[PDB]
Amino acid sequence: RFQAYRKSIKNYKLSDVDYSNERDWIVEQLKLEKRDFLQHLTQAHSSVAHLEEKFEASVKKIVDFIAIESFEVPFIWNHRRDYALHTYNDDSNNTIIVKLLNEDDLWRIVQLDLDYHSIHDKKAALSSIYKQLDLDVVDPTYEEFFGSARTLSELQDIDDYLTFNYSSQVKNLTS
Amino acid sequence: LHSDDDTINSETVEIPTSDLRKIFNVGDHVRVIHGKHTDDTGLIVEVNGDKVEFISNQTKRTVIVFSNYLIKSTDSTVSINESGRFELHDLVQVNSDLVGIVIRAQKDSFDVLCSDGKLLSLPPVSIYSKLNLNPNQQIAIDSNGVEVKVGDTVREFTGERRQGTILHVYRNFLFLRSREIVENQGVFVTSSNRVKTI
Amino acid sequence: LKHGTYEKLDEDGLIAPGVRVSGDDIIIGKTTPIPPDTEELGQRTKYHT
Amino acid sequence: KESIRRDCERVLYFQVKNSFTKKIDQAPYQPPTYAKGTIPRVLTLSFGEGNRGDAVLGVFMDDSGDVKSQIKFDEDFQSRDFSDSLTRYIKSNNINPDIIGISGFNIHTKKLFDKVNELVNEERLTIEYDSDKHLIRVIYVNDETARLYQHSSKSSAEYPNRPQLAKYCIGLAKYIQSPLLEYLALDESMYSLHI
Amino acid sequence: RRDFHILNEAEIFQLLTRETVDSFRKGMVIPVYVRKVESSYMSVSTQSLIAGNIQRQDILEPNDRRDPREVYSVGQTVRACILDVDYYNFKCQLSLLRQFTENQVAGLNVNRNPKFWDIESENRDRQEEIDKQREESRESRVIKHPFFHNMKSKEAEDYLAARPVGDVVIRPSSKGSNHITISWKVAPQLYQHIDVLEENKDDANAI
Amino acid sequence: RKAAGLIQSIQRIGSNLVNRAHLITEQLTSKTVFLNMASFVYIVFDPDVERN
Amino acid sequence: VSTSTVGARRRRAKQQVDDEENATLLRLGPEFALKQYDHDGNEHDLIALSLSESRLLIREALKARSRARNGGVIDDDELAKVTSGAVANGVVKKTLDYLNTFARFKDEETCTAVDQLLHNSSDCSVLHPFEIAQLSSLGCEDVDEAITLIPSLAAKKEVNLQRILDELNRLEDP
Amino acid sequence: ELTERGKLQIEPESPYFDFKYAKNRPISALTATPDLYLRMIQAENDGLVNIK
Amino acid sequence: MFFLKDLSLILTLHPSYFGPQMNQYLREKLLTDVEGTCTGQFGYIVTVLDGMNIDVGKGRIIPGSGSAEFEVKYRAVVWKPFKGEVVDAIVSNVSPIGFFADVGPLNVFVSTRLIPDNLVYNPSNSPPAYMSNDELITKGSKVRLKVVGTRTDVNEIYAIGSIKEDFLGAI
RNA sequence: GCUUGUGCUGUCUUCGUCCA
């Protein structure tokens, strides 16, 4: 099933910096999608500090399992459930288990892992185009809205900006 | 024979069939002689020597069949009789709460028009059952209150004000057959409340 | 079966003398056996033989 | 517009996945005084459309998955003869059902269900493990997979000498014995179900 | 796994009838095949074989006094409105009164909130749809008579101008096919149009 | 596709799988695939058959 | 449904290679042959139409019909809605959109000049009308491009193709 | 907004009648009812309505 | 390609319409039965020139049925694609098997096997597209394609295009 | 609760009927 999912991916093995960016992107995507669950977690478990940091660490560990160790969702759900939940002892010494992630969230993490590679390819192509442009001085707007870019729509916008403002270099390389 | 010399092109040569191989050009209607894809027609797309690839007409997908199994037939004219379990224009139960009418029939698939208008393409096995409704159940009542049976021509008054002859009845929906709506071979679905009898 | 009536026949399939007969009415009842169809799918007393 | 479309498609995808999960998450029926997950012995009945002509066909499947003793009843199901035949059939020493399943094509199946339930209750037909005694259960069976099974060529090859209604009864019994495998046996046809 | 699911009343009804408890409930209107007609009750069968029943107070209109047998006949199919559904016994009660069968059209709980629904555009479109349902067909009238001519009022006056006083011309009337206007020359450049009302007409074109 | 290959391999070796470790020692499956599938396939154990 | 003015064509035994439709070989079949006959049986030539000529003709005919139906009293949508038939309305809407988005000449005088240039020219006196329609429609810019897109023009090398294309580009409104 | 096709063919029977004259529906609430927005898109693809 | 053709239609009229408005009713019936239709022999009929002044002649009474048969001759604008012809198009839909374009009323389907490999289909793109390094073809984008094969139906025409040759693709 | 079923041989030979 992983081979079927990754059959369309041109290159799956990311570098270390790109892999860390992938983990951060998946954490941000899950934070966006699971906003109500995180709000419920923060409100109903106010006594425990920094639960969202534990959520981030758990999501990063699940991404690590799926990408590097290539564990499928049932194996993670059954034999790696301790990384998907957090436990603490209250003032009354009450053992409380909090379930940070479920099986559907693991499937969503798989989907985001698959999705991010298109963003990575688009970003690599855009950076390559910028390299062939070979500006004498780095454009502050380009780097400013390239570092924070996280969707292919903004990459398309940067591509439009580059092909407009530096159309002469594009014509020279080549309306 | 065909050649650059005109004098050679005006000669007929009798040649044994054991030393002849068919020539298939790209963009020709060809009908499959024998195989799993028997009686499939379409247009040739790629000619990889012995193996020929063509976009089908019925399934409308590319099919790879050997060149020995192809005959140049400019028209399909495929008859779907003695196949499946469903005559044309049968009111078929798709699943527990879905029903439709067979619009076009194929060797191993069917085209079904739902009561709401959505079209589906399904294999014959996936269809739940065939509704053999009794004649008394196959009766509806128009907006005026006049009974309308199968074969009665009616014409709408709301909407586009179309007209057709009743082909099937399901609950309040009337399946009508019409001459001018060529989009789905005349079959369009309307509720009995929208029509008036002529 | 035919379109005529069969109520004038007796148990043995023959009409009795003294009975009124009109056109097409059945006066001799005869049947021939036929290898049964797939009606053995279940037809308790109504499968044609 | 594209972003909202993608988000709504994701939400609908997860809803459909949860609905299908609710559909296929069923254990086999647990006979009383036996541990959960034990395969029961099943007897299924159906006359079909419920018309005047239609006869009742029965199929008995044991806990090993082998079809045993398909029978055909040749009398009106509203008569005393059908009740006597069913009482003799169930009380036979070679057949020991744990549950009786009934399904059909229309509302006439309610009469068959009521008749069988009343017969079981009145005659006190109890489960024969051959102490505490329990009556056999009579239920309605969801026939989502049986109607596709009866037309499948695999079923026809498996039972060449049997009619369609016998295959319907076998499908109902197999569904009672293992819903998951019956859903799996549909192959491409399980995407056409009402999920 | 979870325990084997056992069907409830709604699931049994949906299984045996293929009609959900949403698409078959109180207030809906369906066509039913009448099977029995009696003095106080009526028995009908719906499309999905669910046995219906209608009582004396729900068959006839309040202003009606005729016997129910004279009004309906076995085998006829009529429209009826559901008043109760028994999901366990597959039995339902219906009413044939005008107040239930026709008035209840808006069977869906569409959220017509003014801030969330374009009420005025819907009203304008519905008014235009009624103004298009008011459309009618009409055609000219042909009459065979020696002094009849298919002319307007001014055309008839001009035709009578060339003729002396006392000559008579007949033209169709503007009040409808049931009226005929007869114009005769009273005096030079003076004409009288008289409308004639027709009774017991065999046809629109007939006299 | 892996399931059919596994079934054919088992039918080659003798249609009986004695132990979970034989999915690796007999080269039937690779390391990661076995690591995923080891605890989800089981072999029924009869104490009367195995006294040791 | 509709029947052409050309009839007969009964059974024979010989088979010809000039029977299949092919734009490259300029084999347009019998019903689209170079020689046609009118209702009076007189000689008639095949009438090709470029998108400019076709757009002008359809606009003129549609506005004439709309004026006639309104008792002799510009928008494409209303003009399409003048016609009857929902499928006909959709077809005329699609043709109007296609013509509008690829109109090389939206002016009557420019189209007249283009037609005069492509007809009265000595080189174009041998050119097939289909070739003329293709050249005036596709808006090619190069001789090599025109030859690749239109293989028939390869065998007619006695045509001043480049200057005619430049004149067409000049007449084309930028 | 409704096109002419939508102006005619949007009948009470149709599933698209729910949102025939909808307005002031926030984007934040669309994800709660995905079927509604998917039906809007499918109606748009038919050329009946336009989502603005 | 558009053409001018002299076409004829046989129109049958019921005796209930034998009135003074017979000619105009026949004209409107001809217009409704000709405008927008698609015949495989001719292609697509878009409009009829001089639609309000078409001669209808004298109808012949069919023996045994009373109805009159009219022979109506008219000139109409007709469009029909040809094999091996290059025309412009507008992409209407994008799919993994290929893209669907519209050439007026005609819908042309081009499979991936007739598309150059560098124009890789990108389903993640918004909207989905077949894109290359320097080319990007999506819904609503102008494309120039060459018609390879034409499929004739009862009252419909299906065309197949290709963009694998030179001077094709994005424009 | 109970409902009504939907058609016919061929080929010769002989004897007859009304004209012619």
For chain D, strand residue ranges (E) read 42-46, 57-61, 67-72, 99-102, 137-140
What are chain D's partners, defined as 3 or more CB pairs within 8 angstroms?
Answer: A, B, C, E, H, I
Tell me the three-class secondary structure of B45-86, residue by residue.
EEEECCEEEEEECCCCCEEEEEHHHEECCCCCCCCCCCCCCC
Q: How many angstroms is C1' of J10 away from CA of B10?
A: 58
* Phi then psi dihedrals of residue I168, to 5 deg: -120, -170
**Contact with chain G for residue B6, Cβ under 8 A:** no
Structural domain including G125 reads: 49-174
The CA-atom distances, in angstroms, between I69 and each of F23, I14, I39, I63 are: 84, 9, 22, 11
Provide the CA C15 distance to its chain's centre, in angstroms.
13
Chain E residues within an 8 Å CB radius of H22: 116-118
- Same domain assignment for residues G43 and G55: no
Show Cβ contacts of residue B112 under 8 Å, excluding neighbours closer than 6 positions: B92, B94, B100, B101, B102, B103, B119, B120, B121, B122, B127
Which residues lie closer than 8 Å to F47 by C-beta, 6 or more apart? Answer: none
Residue spans of the domains in chain I: they are 1-82, 83-171
Q: How far is the CA of B77 from the C1' of J10 (A)?
A: 38
Given a contact cutoff of 8 angstroms between Cβ atoms, the answer to whether G52 and G105 are in contact is yes
Nearest C-alpha neighbor of H2 from the set H32, H46, H38: H46
List of residues 6+ apart from E70 with CB closer than 8 A: none
Interface check for A70 against chain F (CB to CB < 8 A): the answer is yes
Same domain, G122 and G55: yes
End-to-end CA distance of chain E: 87
Phi then psi for C43, rounded to 5 degrees? Answer: -150, 100
The answer to whether B183 contacts chain H (CB < 8 Å) is no
Q: G30 and G59, same structural domain?
A: no
Secondary structure of chain C: what % helix, strand, coil (to 5)?
10, 5, 85
CA distance F46 to H34: 52
Nearest CA-CA partner of E50 in E96, E95, E92: E92
Domains in chain G: how many in total?
2
From chain H residues 12-41, the ones with a CB under 8 A of any chain E CB are 12, 17-18, 20-25
G6 and G66 co-located in one domain:
no
In this complex, the answer to whether residue E36 has its CB under 7 A from any atom of chain J, a nucleic strand, is yes
| Residue with tokens 């033989």, as numbered in its chain | C49
d(Cα G39, Cα D173) in Å, to the nearest integer?
76
How many C-beta atoms surround the C-beta of residue I168 within 10 A?
19
How far apart (Å, rounded) are the C-alpha atoms in residues B133 and B146? 21
- Of the candidates I109, I103, I75, I106, the residue with the CA atom closest to the CA atom of residue I89: I103
Please check whether residue E41 is in contact with residue E27, taking contact to mean a CB–CB distance below 8 angstroms.
no
Q: Is the CB of C24 under 7 A from strand J?
A: yes
Under 8 Å between Cβ of B136 and B155: no
Cα–Cα distance measured from residue B15 to residue B3, given in angstroms and rounded to the nearest whole number: 17
- Give me the half-sphere count of Cα atoms (radius 13 Å) on the Cβ side of residue G53: 24
Neighbour tally for H27: CB within 10 Å: 11
Measured CA distances, E81 to E19, E52, E59, I115, I118 (Å):
16, 11, 11, 60, 64
CATH architecture of I83-171: Beta Barrel (2.40)
Q: CA-to-CA distance for D87 and G143, rounded, in angstroms?
A: 95
| Cβ pair G89, G81 in contact under 8 A | yes
CATH at G152: 1.20.1250.40
Q: Is the same domain home to G108 and G64?
A: yes
Two tokens, residue G6: 């050309």
Of E98, E99, E120, E104, which Cα lies nearest the Cα of E27? E104
Contact B166, B174 (CB under 8 A): yes
Q: Resolution, in Å, please? A: 3.4
Q: What angle do CA I127, I130, I131 make, to 5 degrees?
A: 95
Calpha distance A21→C31 (Å, rounded): 89
Order of strands across the sheet that contains B110-114? B119-122, B110-114, B98-105, B91-95, B129-130
Q: Is G162 in the same domain as G103?
A: yes
CA gap I68, I106 in Å, rounded: 35
Distance CA F14 to C1' J3 in A: 66
Q: Is D154 on the interface with B (CB under 8 A)?
A: no
**I68, containing H or E segment:** strand I68-79
Whether residue I127 has a cis bond before it, omega within 30° of 0 = yes
> Closest approach of chain C CAs to the CA of D108, in angstroms?
16
Note whether E44 and B141 are within 8 A (CB): no
Fold of I1-82: Dna Ligase; domain 1 (3.30.1490)
One domain for residues G74 and G131: yes
Q: Are residues G41 and G53 in the same domain?
A: no
CA I136 to mean position of chain CA atoms: 27
Say how far residue H8 (Cα) sits from the centre of its chain. 14
- Cα separation, A146 vs A141, whole angstroms: 8
Whether I83-171 and I1-82 are alike in CATH topology: the answer is no
Q: Do residues D84 and D195 touch, judged by C-beta distance below 8 A?
A: no
- Enumerate residues preceding breaks in chain E (C to N > 2.5 Å): none
Alpha helix (H) ranges present in chain E? 9-17, 56-59, 68-71, 98-101, 119-133, 153-161
Does the nearest atom of strand J lie within 7 Å of C46's Cβ? Answer: no
User: Are B131 and B92 in contact, with CB atoms under 8 Å apart?
Assistant: yes
d(CA I82, CA I1): 8
Distance from CA of G144 to the nearest CA of I (A): 10
Residue D43 CA to nucleotide J16 C1', Å? 75
Which residue, G48, G65, G84, sits at the end of a domain? G48
**H or E element that contains A51:** helix A51-64
Task: Say how far apart CA I41 and CA I51 lie, in whole Å.
Answer: 22
Gap from C13 CA to J13 C1', Å: 35
Q: Please name the nucleotide lying closest to C6, CA to C1'.
A: J5
Subunits close to B (at least 3 CB pairs below 8 A)? D, E, G, H, I
Q: Are residues G85 and G95 in the same domain?
A: yes
Whether residues G33 and G10 share a domain: the answer is yes
Would you give the DSSP letter of residue D191? Answer: G
Containing E43, the helix (H) or strand (E) segment is strand E41-45
- D178 CA to J17 C1' distance (Å): 84
In this structure, the answer to whether residues G93 and G172 fall within a common structural domain is: yes
Q: Is A98 exposed, middle or buried (0-12, 13-18, 19+ CB in 10 A)?
A: middle
Q: Which two three-digit tokens encode residue B40?
A: 């499939």
Contact I149, B43 (CB under 8 A): yes
Residue burial A59-88, b: 16+ Cβ < 10 Å; e: rest: bbbbbebbbeeebbbebbbeeeeebbebee
Answer yes or no: do G32 and G68 share one domain: no
Residue of I nearest to D3 (CA): I126
- Tell me the backbone φ, ψ of residue B67, rounded to 5 degrees: -65, -20
I10 vs I57: CA distance, rounded Å: 12
Chains with ≥3 CB–CB distances under 8 Å to G: B, I
Q: Which nucleotide is nearest to C24 (CA to C1')?
A: J7
Residues in chain A closer than 8 A to F36 (CB atoms): 71-72, 75
Q: Are B75 and B81 in contact (CB under 8 A)?
A: no
Nearest CA in chain E to D28: E4
Chains E and H touch (3+ CB pairs under 8 A): yes
Q: How far is I124 from chain A (nearest CA, A)?
A: 7
Q: Contact H26/H20 with Cβ under 8 angstroms?
A: no
d(CA I72, CA A127): 68
Residue A109 structure tokens:
């993490």
Enumerate the residues of chain H whose CB falls inside 8 A of the CB of residue D4. Answer: 27, 30-31, 37
Q: Which residues of chain H neighbour B194 with C-beta distances below 8 Å? A: 11, 13
Q: Which of B176, B188, B191, B195 to mutate against chain H (most H CBs within 10 Å)?
A: B191
Inter-chain residue contact D144 with B129, CB threshold 8 Å: no
Question: Is the distance from CB of E169 to CB of E159 less than 8 angstroms?
Answer: yes
